[PDB]
Paper text:
Here we report a structure-guided approach to engineer monomeric Fc molecules to adapt multiple versions of half-life extension modifications. Past efforts to engineer a monomeric Fc, defined as one set of CH2 and CH3 domains, have proved challenging due to the extensive interactions to be disrupted in the CH3–CH3 dimer interface. Monomeric Fc molecules would provide a quick and robust method for achieving structural insight at the Fc–FcRn interface.
Based on SEC-MALS and DSF results, the S354E mutation was selected to be explored for the general applicability of the MFc platform. First, to confirm its compatibility with our original monomeric Fc construct, we generated MFc3, the S354E point mutant of MFc1, along with its aglycosylated variant (N297D), for crystal structural confirmation. Crystals of the aglycosylated MFc3 protein grew readily and diffracted to 2.4 Å. The solved structure demonstrated that the MFc3 molecule maintained the monomeric state at high protein concentration. MFc3 in the aglycosylated form (N297D) was crystallized in the C2221 space group with cell parameters a = 102.97 Å, b = 110.93 Å, c = 87.18 Å, Matthews parameter VM = 2.49 Å3/Da with two polypeptides in the asymmetric part of the unit cell, and solvent content of 50.62%. The diffraction limit of the crystal was 2.3 Å. Superposition of MFc3 (orange) with a previously resolved structure of MFc2 (or C4n) (light purple) shows that both maintained a similar monomeric Fc structure, and the S354E mutation did not cause any notable change in the Fc domain structures. Aside from a minor change of the R405 side chain position, all the other original sets of dimer-disruptive mutations in MFc1 aligned nearly perfectly with each other. Using solution analytical methods and crystallography, we demonstrated that S354E was able to sustain a monomeric Fc structure, and the glutamic acid side chain protruded out as designed.
Residue numbers in the entry: 238 to 444
Write the structure that this text describes.
């Protein structure tokens, strides 16, 4: 009977028109609905604006209950503590979790792009690489774009810790070789709190 607490999507905290939320999940292998209750707290003060969904059966036959707490962009970025406490109805025993933005001087990402490797120029689909390093905290969003429109066909690694305490990750965008050959510009878009206006972009095209 275990509880998970997830931070907001990094993009949501960095763009004020987005709706960042923290997410509390209860996973339970037992059919018996124990009628879980959530208490939420921001820096130890209970709040009441969480939206909790009904118990649902998962594909693996376990049961999960999801509770979402809307958060203020600055509240997350200023290191406020989000506490999820879970109770079965009228039974005082409880499990809690706490998360918060990691502490430490924010550091700006450095962004590198790489064209496809030439022994890949024999394939129908080629890869573009965006390497991002030197950043703190780990909270970051990496996306791609071309001709002012999003590219969805990318995979991004989990953040890895370098030995100076800053993080790094790599994204790879897979596109049809014809698109790369026709001279289209592909932008790696990087969103991090330590970047000016939380955004920078590096661009890649054939010459």
């Amino acid at each position: 009977p275990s509880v998970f607490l997830f931070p907001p999507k990094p993009k949501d905290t960095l763009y004020i028109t987005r709706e960042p939320e923290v997410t509390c999940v209860v996973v339970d292998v037992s059919q018996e609905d124990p009628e879980v209750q959530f208490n939420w707290y921001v820096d130890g003060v209970e709040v009441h604006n969480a939206k909790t969904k009904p118990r649902e059966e998962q594909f693996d036959s376990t049961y999960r209950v999801v509770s979402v707490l809307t958060v203020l962009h600055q509240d997350w970025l200023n290191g406020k503590e989000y506490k999820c406490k879970v109770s079965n109805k009228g039974l005082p025993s409880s499990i809690e979790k706490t998360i918060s933005k990691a502490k430490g001087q924010p550091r700006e990402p450095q962004v590198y792009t790489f064209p496809p490797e030439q022994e890949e120029m024999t394939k129908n689909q080629v890869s573009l690489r965006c390497l991002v390093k030197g950043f703190y905290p780990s909270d970051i969003a990496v996306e791609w774009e071309s001709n002012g429109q999003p590219e969805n066909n990318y995979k991004t690694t989990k953040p890895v810790l370098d030995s100076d305490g800053s993080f790094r990750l790599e994204s790879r965008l897979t596109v049809d070789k014809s698109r790369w050959q026709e001279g289209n510009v592909f932008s790696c878009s990087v969103m991090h709190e330590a970047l000016h206006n939380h955004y920078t972009q590096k661009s890649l095209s054939l010459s």
